[PDB]
RNA sequence: CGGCCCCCUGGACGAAGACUGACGCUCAGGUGCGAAAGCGUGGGGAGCAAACAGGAUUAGAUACCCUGGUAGUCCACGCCGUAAACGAUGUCGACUUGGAGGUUGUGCCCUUGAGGCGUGGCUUCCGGAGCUAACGCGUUAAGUCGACCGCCUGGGGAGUAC
């Protein structure tokens, strides 16, 4: 996330850019995840758990939308 | 009686998307154009006629017909049709166990009548404003629900339904009571509960109107007979 | 109740009060046994009408279909 | 809308530094195909080629590293 | 591996009835044909039609009465794991004779009742009801 | 695997038509040639168990073919092993 | 003309904040002494009410059975959820050889001669269910003859 | 009989996929939903915001006819894509007509340049334009009467993107997206782009040659976190967004809307 | 089993053809392979970390937390042969309604475009009949059958004792 302030560029705008860059770089998350060793099962476990939630989110909810609430 | 051209013009042949089809409708489907199912009219019309004949038979013996449609697209029309042949109908939400638990709904009808009498023949007015409002609101509520089956009589000898899957609750009740069923069955629906399936476009308004008008006519004919 | 429930389809009541009172009844295919309900446990309700207005030969017929079965 | 499909490339070339660049992040990372519309088959090749390039210093490992 | 074709044939019939299939096709064999003929004789199928020269396909036309299927139950009795042979006196009665038990005799394949009349036992292929 | 040219060379030798490519004799030869070829490979990489699995499969399949040959035609069976020099 | 037998009455509980709320289940069966049979299962706070419900339900959801003069028309197996039931026609006079709940239903059905053992579970509610199921599938010679398209004599 | 077939193809022959044949009769009007029947399976749930013209009020009562669009079927129940797009076809046709005589004659006011090119308006819709077109010469109609209406004379179009530059002035005068993605690039070239779908993190405005904008959620407004883009802008609407970033590599032009 | 490269190498799958011609299935014993830990010899040893030490906490804290930290984790060759070695689902074969995906082939179609129409393999999810104690499974079955094998027979005692 190297950044150079453009000419006549306000400081805050640059800073906001930098945060945007870090988010896109996804650095904080990566540091967080690497902070402690995750047993591979735990990793596999999370990944599969995560996927399942996505699918349930995508589908089961979509079907519900078909029916009105009130 | 109803010509096939007429149905096609209405838009009967059109069905639901393929991915929602119910395989029990495979016999009634003709094909799938543009990723949408097409109802084989050749198999439609004779079935429809057969049903119409059956209804006419029922009307002849002074049968009570019940028209069920709550799509809220075809709610107006079904009410209209039922009145045309002065039959009773349920254009709004089918009360669970309306037929099976008739003895209870019988009470609700009775309440409705009283409210109506109070409103009109009473001419009583001088009723507390908030009380009056509640009565009016209640009366409206019942009318919306049971208006069609207030002057229809009692349990129906036959049951015409505009969308099987949508009205499966009604379908089930009729099957438990054994009342013959005449359902418009779209491709997504399940025809098993139905006695006289009518493979057709439940959804489109014109088609629904087409469906009703024939039914209304044959009923009236049966009555005249 | 079933007829006080518009279930037991009761058309005409061709009966002669003071002697015999035979009447047929149908049902909108609800498998409720119109005559059975009209009779009851060993003519439970049948006895009621039997000694109701006076000793009458009340009878119930399981209406089949149309006038031919009538 | 995979470019490679229209080109129908039998195989992506790591030498094709411009084309890879067309899928390397300004920070130096690898693109999800969602964003490109690249088919997954070609995607795996693209990643492989990008790695190969990285090794020859044709592409950088990260914008920052030096 | 395919170890019992006859059992396979029956199963095809059983499922086909279950799924309300009009007709059921399978690789023909002389034995299968004989059985099919018996079923048609006893009226458990409308008709069977073998077709093909190199590797013929037997095609059965299932029977449905009043909606529900005609062949209520169909079991192998003899089977490669365990063969069953009955003498004319020991021939079974499926459903006390309402059903039929296909039995292979010296004098061709026949229903048990026929075999009893014929007066000779044999290998009991399958029960039908 | 066995190089295309090699296979053809074997096929021509053992197959009668040289197009047949299905003759029991031909298949055995093919397996044998490959088996011998790998012997060099596994001598080097003793721990490559996955590959060795494929080898055994080849061995097993070879054994069955021979056995099939044996009951069907002995003389061919005898002639064949003599050609390949299979102890059994 | 309908006879009614209450098979079993059982007390069942439902735990609530205060304590246990007890209720009763009545399993009853009714028949005409001919084909027509129907079981009823009622539930209520007081036994007499419960049994009355069961009688009430049983009277509906009847079912017909083809009965060779006194007995069944052929050996029949009937299963439901635990109870798997075998029952077999038997010579005149032998009476109803059957156990427990299965006994009662047969009686109202008007079967007078049956040999029937109830394998598997013997929980009243299911076993009666099986018997109904078995009797239900039981087909008469006339029925099959129609089914297969043959005369009865062809079937003998 | 074969009546059904011949008719079946006849009805195939008398209807087309796009919104081309003005066939749908308005059978029901209620704010804020119009609906028609163009001989499809089901009746369209039309917004009222495709069918009010240039001042906000509705224009078409029952019996009026506009085609809508198709090629997307049954998102579960119903049928269409909106007739507003159909009109885009008509605008393209009139624009093409210029070619015939090399002069489309329209009435165009290009007041000011969002992305270096004044925006020129057709009676209903508003477009974004290149810089050179806005005047044939350097007249620079910023000194002209605000929103002067003289004409529309095409200097530049991308011929794929909906970007048309009109010379409103001087009557007398008369793979593919990703190799050369540097036209809207420099820093802040504004664009007029229709939003497609708001994913609860963003809005996905994307109009220029099969590309994708994200504006997601951070700018969108002058409120950062409590915004929920669906509440704040629209669904299916042409907006002010600018590029603010191009990754021609990571093919994610991160547009903005706080500008 | 996961950076990239080369050498040797197994398997799977698709297209058509050509060939052999039942050569198949399963499998007691038997043979092999078999995570992690562990054992041996010899290397290697960053991080991490049983053991251990100390600091905390606590009534205690032989732990959770903190500061360190050796075996091991790594390499070679052997041994060990067990894991919730799990889909808690033996293997092979056939049949029985659908839907939505993923992935990998391949035929045709104006690819007139990312398309259109198929036809295979593997695979994820939902679900029909059916089945099931229910939970659920549901063409990858726990549905419908067939072949063979293994295994079960109350709980503890005990997968322990000899």
Automatic annotation (TrEMBL), chain A:
Region: Disordered, residue numbers: 42-70
Pfam family membership, one: Ribosomal_S21
Biased composition (Basic and acidic residues): 59-70
Gene3D superfamilies (UniProt xref): Ribosomal protein S8
Sequence ranges of Basic residues compositional bias: 45-58
Keywords per UniProt: Ribonucleoprotein, Ribosomal protein
NCBIfam families: S21p
Family under the similarity heading: Belongs to the bacterial ribosomal protein bS21 family.
PANTHER family referenced in this protein's UniProt entry, alphabetically: MITOCHONDRIAL 28S RIBOSOMAL PROTEIN S21 (PTHR21109), SMALL RIBOSOMAL SUBUNIT PROTEIN BS21 (PTHR21109:SF22)
Protein name stated in the entry: Small ribosomal subunit protein bS21
Source species: Escherichia coli (strain UMEA 3162-1)
UniProtKB/TrEMBL annotation, chain D:
Family matches, as SUPFAM superfamilies: Ribosomal protein S18
GO molecular function: small ribosomal subunit rRNA binding; structural constituent of ribosome
InterPro entries referenced in this protein's UniProt entry, alphabetically: Ribosomal_bS18, Ribosomal_bS18_CS, Ribosomal_bS18_sf
GO biological process: translation
Subunit structure: Part of the 30S ribosomal subunit. Forms a tight heterodimer with protein bS6.
Function, in words: Binds as a heterodimer with protein bS6 to the central domain of the 16S rRNA, where it helps stabilize the platform of the 30S subunit.
UniProt similarity note: Belongs to the bacterial ribosomal protein bS18 family.
Protein name: Small ribosomal subunit protein bS18
Gene: rpsR
């Amino acid at each position: 996330p190297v950044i150079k302030v453009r000419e006549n560029e306000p400081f805050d705008v640059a800073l906001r850019r930098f945060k945007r860059s870090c988010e896109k770089a996804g650095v904080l998350a990566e540091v967080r995840r690497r902070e402690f060793y995750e047993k591979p099962t735990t990793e596999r476990k999370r990944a599969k758990a995560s996927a399942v939630k996505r699918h349930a989110k995508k589908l089961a909810r979509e079907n519900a939308r078909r029916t009105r609430l009130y | 009686t109803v010509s096939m051209r007429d149905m096609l013009k209405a838009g009967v042949h059109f069905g639901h998307q393929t991915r929602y089809w119910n395989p029990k409708m495979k016999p009634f489907i003709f094909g799938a154009r543009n990723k949408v199912h097409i109802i084989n009219l050749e198999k439609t019309v004779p079935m429809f006629n057969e049903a119409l004949a059956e209804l006419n038979k029922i009307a002849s013996r002074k049968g009570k017909i019940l028209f069920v449609g709550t799509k809220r697209a075809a709610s107006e029309a079904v009410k209209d049709a039922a009145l045309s042949c002065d039959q009773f109908f349920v254009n709004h939400r089918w009360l669970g166990g309306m037929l099976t638990n008739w003895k209870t709904v019988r009470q609700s009808i009775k309440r409705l009548k009283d409210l109506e009498t109070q409103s009109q023949d009473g001419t009583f007015d001088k009723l507390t404003k908030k009380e009056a409002l509640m009565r009016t609101r209640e009366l409206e509520k019942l009318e919306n629900s049971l208006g069609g089956i207030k002057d229809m009589g009692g349990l129906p000898d036959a049951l015409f339904v505009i969308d099987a899957d949508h009205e499966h609750i009604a379908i089930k009740e009729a099957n438990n009571l054994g009342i013959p069923v005449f359902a418009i069955v779209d491709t997504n629906s399940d025809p098993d509960g139905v006695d006289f399936v009518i493979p057709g476009n439940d959804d489109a308004i014109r088609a629904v109107t087409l469906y009703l008008g024939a039914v209304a006519a044959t009923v009236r004919e049966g009555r005249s007979q | 109740p079933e007829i006080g429930e518009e279930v037991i389809e009761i058309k005409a009541a061709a009966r002669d009060p003071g002697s015999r009172a035979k009447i047929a009844v149908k049902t909108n295919d609800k498998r409720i046994d119109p005559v059975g309900a009209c009779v009851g446990m060993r003519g439970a309700r049948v006895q009621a009408v039997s000694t109701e207005l006076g000793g009458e030969r009340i009878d119930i017929v399981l209406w089949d279909d149309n006038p031919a079965q009538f | 809308f995979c470019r490679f499909t229209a080109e129908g490339v039998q195989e992506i070339d790591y030498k094709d530094i411009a084309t890879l660049k067309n899928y390397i992040t300004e920070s130096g990372k690898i693109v999800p195909s969602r964003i490109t519309g690249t088919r997954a088959k070609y995607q795996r090749q693209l990643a492989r080629a990008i790695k190969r390039a990285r090794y020859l210093s044709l592409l950088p490992y990260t914008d920052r590293h030096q | 591996s395919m170890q019992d074709p006859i059992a396979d044939m029956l199963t095809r019939i059983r499922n086909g009835q279950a799924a309300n299939k009009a007709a059921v096709t399978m690789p023909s064999s002389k034995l299968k044909v004989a059985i099919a003929n018996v079923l048609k004789e006893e009226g458990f199928i409308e008709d069977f039609k073998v077709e093909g020269d190199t590797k013929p396909e037997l095609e059965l036309t299932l029977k449905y009465f009043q909606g529900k299927a005609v062949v209520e139950s169909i079991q192998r009795v003899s089977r490669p794991g365990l063969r069953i042979y009955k003498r004319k006196d020991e021939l079974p009665k499926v459903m006390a004779g309402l059903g039929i038990a296909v039995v292979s005799t010296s004098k061709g394949v026949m229903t048990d009742r026929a075999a009893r009349q014929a007066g000779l036992g044999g290998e009991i292929i399958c029960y039908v009801a | 695997s066995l190089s295309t040219e090699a296979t053809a060379k074997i096929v021509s030798e053992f197959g009668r038509d040289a197009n047949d490519t299905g003759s029991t004799e031909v298949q055995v030869a093919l397996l044998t040639a490959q088996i011998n070829h790998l012997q060099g490979h596994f001598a080097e990489h003793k721990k490559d168990h996955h590959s060795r699995r494929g080898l055994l499969r080849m061995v097993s399949q070879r054994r069955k073919l021979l056995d099939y040959l044996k009951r069907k035609d002995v003389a061919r069976y005898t002639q064949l092993i003599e050609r390949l020099g299979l102890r059994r | 003309e309908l006879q009614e037998k209450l098979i079993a009455v059982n007390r069942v509980s439902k735990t609530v904040k205060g304590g246990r709320i007890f209720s009763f289940t009545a399993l009853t069966v009714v028949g005409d002494g001919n084909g027509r049979v129907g079981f009823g299962y009622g539930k209520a706070r007081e036994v007499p009410a419960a049994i009355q419900k069961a009688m009430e339900k049983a009277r509906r959801n009847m079912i017909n059975v083809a009965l060779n003069n006194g007995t069944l028309q052929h050996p029949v197996k009937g299963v439901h959820t635990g109870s798997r039931v075998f029952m077999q026609p038997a010579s005149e006079g032998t009476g109803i050889i059957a156990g427990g709940a299965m006994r009662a239903v047969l009686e109202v059905a008007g079967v007078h001669n049956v040999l029937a053992k109830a394998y598997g579970s013997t929980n009243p509610i299911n076993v009666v269910r099986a018997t109904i199921d078995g009797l239900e599938n039981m087909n008469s010679p006339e029925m099959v003859a129609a089914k297969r398209g043959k005369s009865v004599e062809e079937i003998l | 009989e074969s009546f059904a077939q011949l008719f079946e193809e006849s009805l195939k022959e008398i209807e087309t996929r796009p919104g081309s044949i003005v066939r749908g009769v308005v059978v029901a009007i209620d704010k804020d939903v119009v609906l028609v029947d163009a001989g499809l399976k089901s009746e369209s749930a039309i917004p009222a915001e495709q069918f009010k013209n240039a001042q906000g009020e509705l224009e078409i009562q029952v019996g009026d006819e506009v085609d809508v669009a198709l090629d997307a079927v049954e998102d579960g129940f119903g049928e269409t894509l909106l007739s507003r797009e159909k009109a885009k076809r008509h605008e393209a046709w009139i624009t093409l007509e210029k070619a015939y005589e090399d002069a489309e004659t329209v009435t165009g006011v290009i007041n000011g340049k969002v992305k270096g090119g004044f925006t020129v308006e057709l009676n209903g819709i508003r477009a974004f334009l290149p810089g050179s077109l806005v005047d044939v010469r350097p007249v620079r109609d910023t000194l002209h009467l605000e929103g002067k209406e003289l004409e529309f004379k095409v200097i530049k179009l991308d011929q794929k993107r909906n970007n048309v530059v009109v010379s409103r002035r001087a009557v007398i005068e008369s793979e593919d997206p990703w190799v050369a993605i540097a036209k809207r690039y420099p820093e802040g070239t504004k664009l007029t782009g229709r939003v497609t779908n708001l994913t609860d993190y963003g809005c996905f405005v994307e109009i220029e040659e099969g590309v994708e904008g994200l504006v997601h959620v951070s700018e969108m407004d002058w409120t950062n976190k409590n915004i929920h883009p669906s509440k704040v802008v629209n669904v299916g609407d042409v907006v002010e967004v600018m590029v603010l970033d191009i990754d021609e590599e990571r093919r994610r032009i991160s547009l903005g809307l706080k500008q």
